[PDB]
Amino acid sequence: ASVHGTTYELLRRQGIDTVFGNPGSNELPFLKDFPEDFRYILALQEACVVGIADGYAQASRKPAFINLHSAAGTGNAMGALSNAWNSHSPLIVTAGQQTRAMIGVEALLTNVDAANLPRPLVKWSYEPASAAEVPHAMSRAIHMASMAPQGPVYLSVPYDDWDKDADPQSHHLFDRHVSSSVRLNDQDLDILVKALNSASNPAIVLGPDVDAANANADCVMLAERLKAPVWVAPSAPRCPFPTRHPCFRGLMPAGIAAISQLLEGHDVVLVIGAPVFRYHQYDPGQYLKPGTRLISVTCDPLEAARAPMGDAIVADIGAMASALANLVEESSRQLPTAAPEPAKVDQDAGRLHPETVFDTLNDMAPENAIYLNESTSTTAQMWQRLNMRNPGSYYACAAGGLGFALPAAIGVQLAEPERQVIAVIGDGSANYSISALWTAAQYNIPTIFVIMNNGTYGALRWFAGVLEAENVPGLDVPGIDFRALAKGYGVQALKADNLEQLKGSLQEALSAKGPVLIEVSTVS
Amino acid sequence: ASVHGTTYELLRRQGIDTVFGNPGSNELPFLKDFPEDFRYILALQEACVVGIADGYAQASRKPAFINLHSAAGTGNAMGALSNAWNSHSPLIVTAGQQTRAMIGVEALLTNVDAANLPRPLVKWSYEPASAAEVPHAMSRAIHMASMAPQGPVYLSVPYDDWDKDADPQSHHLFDRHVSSSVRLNDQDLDILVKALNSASNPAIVLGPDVDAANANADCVMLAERLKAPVWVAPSAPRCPFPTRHPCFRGLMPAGIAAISQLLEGHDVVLVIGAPVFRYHQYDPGQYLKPGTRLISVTCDPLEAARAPMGDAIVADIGAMASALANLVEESSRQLPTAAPEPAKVDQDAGRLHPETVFDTLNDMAPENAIYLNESTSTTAQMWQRLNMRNPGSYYACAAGGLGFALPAAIGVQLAEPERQVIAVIGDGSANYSISALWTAAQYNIPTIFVIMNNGTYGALRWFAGVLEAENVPGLDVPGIDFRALAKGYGVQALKADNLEQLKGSLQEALSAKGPVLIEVSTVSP
Amino acid sequence: ASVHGTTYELLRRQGIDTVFGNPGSNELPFLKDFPEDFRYILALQEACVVGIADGYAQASRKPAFINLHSAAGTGNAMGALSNAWNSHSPLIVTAGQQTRAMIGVEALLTNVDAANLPRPLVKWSYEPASAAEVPHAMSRAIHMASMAPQGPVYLSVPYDDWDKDADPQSHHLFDRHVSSSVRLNDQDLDILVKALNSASNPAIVLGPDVDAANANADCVMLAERLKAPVWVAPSAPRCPFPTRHPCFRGLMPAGIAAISQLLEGHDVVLVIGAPVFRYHQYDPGQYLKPGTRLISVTCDPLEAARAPMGDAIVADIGAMASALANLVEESSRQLPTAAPEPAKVDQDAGRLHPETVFDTLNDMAPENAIYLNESTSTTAQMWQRLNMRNPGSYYACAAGGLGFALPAAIGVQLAEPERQVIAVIGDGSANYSISALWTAAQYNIPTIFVIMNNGTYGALRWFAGVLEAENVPGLDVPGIDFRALAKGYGVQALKADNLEQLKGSLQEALSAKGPVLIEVSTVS
C-alpha cells in the first residue's frame, strides 16, 4: 500500500475523520483522492484553521487534525499555536514540505529547518528521514498530542512521500492503544485523602484540565464531601464547575497577593488541573500566608516543576478526581452557602454596560449554551453573570492571544451541533481572525457572534491608566462596520444600540437558521 | 537616563522615525511618552503590521521598526516573517515580554524561550539579560537587520526594563556607522571583467537584491555594454530591470530543466542579486547545459553555498553592479532579437480574462506606477503585459506566503506617496490579511486594490490537473463580497463585471484621493 | 539572604549534599563559602565529572548535582549527556555564565545562547532573567530532573547573581514534594491483569527503568507468578533481573527479526521499563510475528509514542511493577527451567579469551559485586558468564557513547562503599575518559578497573567484516601502556598476560583498599 493509503487508514483507525486545512501545492499529494469517510473543513487563513481545530478538539475531548502549507502557512498559525499550548489542546499539525529532491537547493515553498519553526509551542516537532517512515511518524504525532499533558505537535512531510510504498509492518500502528490514565499509588493516595479528611477549613481550586478531562461532576462530589468552597484558577481558559453550585466562589484574581489573601485561613488548598498559578498583573506579595498548605494535582510536569509553592502530584486529572471524590469522607461541616446573585446595574437608554449584556444572555440563552470570551475588559463581569451548569460551557484564549474565540466558536459549534454557541468578542479582537466567519457560512455552522463595540482596545486603555502612562498611541479602533464585514463573508448581521434592541437581536439570532453576527454598542 | 529615553535616542540617531505596531500590555511601558518626532502606524493583526512594515522597508530601502505583543503577537506574524527572510527585508521586530519578576512562574503573556520562537526565520533573535543592556541589544538588532544580507531580526524586552537606568556608556551606540558596501578585490575583479569581455555569448540573470540596492540602472548599462539578454530570476519578489528594454527576455520559469534550456548556448552566464535559483515546480533535468559556465554575485553567503553550480562572489550588489557596469568593454555584437508582443486575447462581454485586465492596466496606469502581485495563477501574463520601466515597480511574496501584498501595498504607498500603488490580488489571497484595509482608510493611504475574483484557488486547481489529482478538497472560495469587506473597513469600493466597468472603475480609482478597492469578476479556470 | 545561601538551603532541603565539578571563574562566586554539609568531588575533565555524577545518580537512585564552566565545560560533557539522556539519569547540570553586564559584548567565557547548547540531550534547559529568580529556577531544575521520566537538566547562572538578594518568598521552595509515583487506574489495571491471567504463553521483557526503580524484586515475583520467561531488552544499560534465576533467558539481540523470532508463539509479551525496542544492527523483518500481542509499561511518553507495535501504558515503573506483581494469579504452568551453565572455552597458556576473563571474575568476585561494561565486543559473553543476583549490579553506556564506564564506576563505588565495583573496559574505550582515574586516587575510591587489551577496536573490525568493507582506516590502537597511564594518575597497576597472572592480579586487587587497574592481554 502507499504511504498515502496507510496514513489515512492509521488516522481513521485512531478515531480521526476530519481535516482542518488551508491547502497548498506541497499538500495536494496528501489531499488527492481524499477518502469519502473524511471531512475537510476549509478556512481562509491559518490562524483561523488552527483556531477552529482548537475549539473542535477542546469541546470534543479528542485530537484534531490540521493540514497547513509549508513554513508560511505554519507561520500564519503560530499565534493560534501559542493558545493551544497553554490550553493543552491535542492538535496534530501537519505541513507540506517540498519534494525531497528540491529541498537542498531551497526551492520556493521549502520549509527550512522545519522542525524548529513551531518551537517552543509544540510537544514534539519532526520531519521523517524517508517516505516509508511517514506513517510511523504520524503515529508518534497522534500519541504525543493525545498523551497527558495533551498539546500540539508538528509533522512536516515532503510531498513526494505520499505516493511511495509504505512498510507493510506499518499495520502494527493501526490499533495501538496508549494510555496515560494514571493516578497516585495507593499508599500515597491514602496519605493525601487523610490530609483532606483532617483539614479543618479546606479549599479547592480548579483549572481547565478538569473540564478537558470531564472531571467536573467528580469535582462537584469532592467539594460536596469536603464542604469546601471552590474557586476557578486565574486566567481561566475553560469552566470546570457549575457556576451556581453552592460551593462556587468564582474566578480568582490573577495576582500573587490577591490569591494568598483569598486563601488566608484555609489550612489545606487542593489545586486540580491548573498551573500554580497563571498570574497576570503585577501584584507582588506572599505566594501563600502562613497557615495555608497547598497541594497540586496536575497532568503536566512542567506545571509541577514551576509552581513556586506547595506539594505536587503529576497524574491524569480524570483518574485522580474520580479517586479522590470517591475516597474522601463526608464531612459533617456545613455545606457552603451559594454566593449572592449579581446585582442589577442601572441601565439607561444609552450604550450597553457589559453587565447588562451578560445578564441578558443569561436570561435568554439555553441552559446548555456554550460561551466563548474574547472581551478582555469584561471577563470578571461575565464570570459573575452567566449560569453555566454543564461541562464544556466556556472557552477563552489560554495564552491571551487574540484571534482565538471567533474561529474556536465555529469549531466548538461543529463539535456540538446540539448546543448553541455564543461568542462574546471585543471590537478589537474581532479583527484578528475575521475571515473565519466564512467557514461558518459555508459549512452552515450556526454560531452566534456578539461583538462588543466600544471603539477601543479597552483593557489596554485601562492598564495605561493604571500605570499613569500618557501619550500611548494605537489604543483606538474607530471606523469598523461589523455588519458589513459579516455580509462580506455571507453571515447574517444585526445591530443593537440599546437594551431593547439587544433583546430583539438575541431573540432573532437564537431562532435564525444560520450563523449570526450582532454588533452591540457598548460603553468604553 | 532611562532605557526608554536612551532607546528612542538610539533609534532617531540611527534614522528610524516610524513604528509599525499592534500594541499590548507588555509594550505599554515602551509606547508611553511616545516622542513627537516619531509616528506610529497601527494595524489590526500582526501579519498586517509586519506586511505593511515590509512593503515600507523594501520601497524606502531602509530598515523598518516593528513592535508586537509577546508570543501571540509574534506568532501571528511568522508567516509574514517567512516572506521577509526570503526578500532580505531589514525589519527590526521587537516584542514585549512579562516583567522579569514574573517570567519564572510563566505568568500569562510570558514569552517562553522567546528567542527560539521566530527561528529559523530571523538573522538574529535575542532577549537581554538585564535592563541596562537593552539599548545595546537594540543597537545589535538595528545593525544585524541592516548589514548585508539584510533581513529580519527579533528582540524580546521585559516590560519592566524600560523605566530602568540605562548604562551611561550607551551614548557610544548612538552614532555607530556599520558598512558592508564591499566589492571584489581589484585583482580578482579584473579576472571577472576579462571573462565578461571574452565571452562570445554572455547572458545576465537578475534577482531582487538588484532592485533592493537600486542597481537597476547599472545593470541596464552592463547589459547594454555586453549586448546581453537579461532574464529575471524565477519566483521574483521584485523587478530588477525595465521590462520593455531591448535586452529584457522575461521572467524565468521556476524549473531546473526550463532554465538550463533558456541558457543553452550562452558561454558565460552572470547572475546578480539572486539565489541560484528559486525553482518551484518539479522540472527535473540539467542545472546547466554543457558549454555554459555560471558566475553568481550575491550578498548572501547562504545563497552562494547552496547554489548547485557556478562560481560565486559574496559582496554588495550596489557596489559590484556599479563597478562591473563601468569596467566592462563595449561589445559590438548585435542586441538580442526583439521579443514578440503578447497576444490580445478575445474578450467576450462577460467575465474578464486576466490578460484583459493586465492590458487595460498597462494602457491606463501612469508610467511610474508600482504593482504588487498576489494573483498566483496570472503571474506569467502579468510579467508579459506590464511595462515597468522604473526601479521599485514590483513586489510579490518572496516565500510564496499569501497575505503579503495587501498590507505591503499600503506600506509601499506610504513610502512612495508620489507613485500610485496598484495591488493585484486574487480573491483567495485577499483574505489572509484583509484587515490591513483599515490601516489604509485610517491613515488615508491611497493604494488601489484590484481583486481578481474567479471564485477559486486557481493555481491550485491547475496544479491538481497537471498532477491528475482527483477529489482534492478545499479549492473553491465562493461567497465573498469584497465591496462589503471594503466598506467594513472604511475603504471605497467599486465592482467591475465587464471590460467597460473595468475601464470606468480604474478611471475613478486613479482620480480618487483615498484608498480604493475594485472587485473584478475574472474568468474561472 | 543571598541567592547563594538560599540556593544551598534549597539544595540541602531537597536532599543534595554532593557537588561533582570541574571549577572555573564563572563558578567561583557559587563555590565560595562552600557549606560544611556538602562535599565536592573534583574531576579533571568534564566528561569525567558527568560520568562520575551519572554513576552516582544511577546507583543511588537519587539526583546528582553537577557544576561546570560555561560553554566549553558544558561542551566537553555533551557526549556524557547523550548517555545520561538514554539512561534517564537524574542529573542537575549547572554551568556558570559571565556577569550580566558583560554578556552583551560577548566577553570571554560568555555562554552564548546558553539554553540551546545542551539541546536536545536535556529535559529542560534554562537561564534565569534575574538574580532573584535563581533559587526558583534551581527548584525547577531539581524537580524536572527527578520526575518520571527522569533525565538530565541544564541551568546557566550569571556569576554576579549569587551575591544578590534572594526573593524572601523563596522559602516556599525548600520543602516542596513532587510525586510522579503513579499507576494505571483500577478499572484499566483490572483489564490488564485479566489479560495477563488469561495468557497461555506469556513472556516478560525488562529494561533499565526497572533497575532504576528497584522494581527487580517485584518483577521476579511477577515472573514467578506468571511462570514466564524473562528477557532483558536489547542494548541494556542496566541489569533488571537476577541472571541465574530460572526464568531468566538473557539479553535480547538488538535486531528486529531476531526479536520477533524470539517472541514467536508467545501470545502476550509484557515489556516493562524499556524502549520498544533499542535495536542496533540492521536486521529487517517483522516487528512481531502473527499471534503475538505486546503491552508496554514505560515511564516515558517518548518511548510510548515511538513504539512501532503494541499497546502502552505510561506510568511509574516501581508503582506498576509492584501492583502487577501483587494482583496477578499464581499460574498452574510449570516454572521455566534455568538456562544451562556456560561451556568452558579452550584456553591455552598465552593470551586470554574474554570467556576466560569472565569465568575467573565470576568465580572470584563477591556476590554483591557491581560490574560496568565498556567492552563492546564481549558484551554477549559477559551477560552469560557473570552471575548477578542483586539489583544495581550492571551499568553500560546507554547511548553507546564511549567514556562512560571508567568515570561512572568511580561514581557507583562512591555511592556503594560496601559493594566492590569492577569495570571491564576495552583498551580502545579506556582512553576516552582516562583522567577520571585521578578522582579515584584522590578520594581513595577503591574501584577495580580491568582493561581488556586486544590492541584494536574489535567491534568495529568485526562489523567491517559483515559489511565486506575493505580498506577502513583507524581501527587499530597499538602502543598503549595502561599501567603507565594508571601510574600517571596515582592508581596502583597490575598486569595479566596469562590465566595464572590474571588470578593473582585479581586476588591482589580485591584485597586492595585503594583503586587498582589491571591490564589484561586478550585475544581477538
Ligand SMILES: Cc1ncc(C[n+]2csc(CCOP(=O)(O)OP(=O)(O)O)c2C)c(N)n1
Ligand atoms: C494577538 C494579540 N495581539 C495583541 C494583544 C494585546 N491586547 C490584549 S487585550 C487587547 C485589547 C482587546 O480589545 P477588545 O477586543 O476591544 O477588548 P476590550 O479591551 O475592548 O474589552 C490587546 C490589543 C493580544 N493579547 N493578542
Ligand SMILES: Cc1ncc(C[n+]2csc(CCOP(=O)(O)OP(=O)(O)O)c2C)c(N)n1
Ligand atoms: C499563507 C498561504 N496559505 C496557503 C498557500 C497555498 N496557496 C498558494 S497559491 C494559492 C491559491 C491562491 O488563489 P488566489 O489568490 O485566488 O489566486 P489564483 O490562484 O486564483 O490566481 C494557495 C492556497 C500559500 N501560498 N500561502
Ligand SMILES: Cc1ncc(C[n+]2csc(CCOP(=O)(O)OP(=O)(O)O)c2C)c(N)n1
Ligand atoms: C564516543 C564514541 N566514539 C566512537 C564510538 C564508536 N565505537 C563503538 S565501539 C568502538 C571500539 C571499542 O573498542 P574497545 O573499547 O577496545 O573494545 P572492543 O571493541 O575491542 O571489544 C568505537 C570506536 C562510540 N561508541 N563512542
Ligand SMILES: [Ca+2]
Ligand atoms: Ca473594545
Ligand SMILES: [Ca+2]
Ligand atoms: Ca482565485
Ligand SMILES: [Ca+2]
Ligand atoms: Ca579493543
Ligand SMILES: [Mg+2]
Ligand atoms: Mg521557532
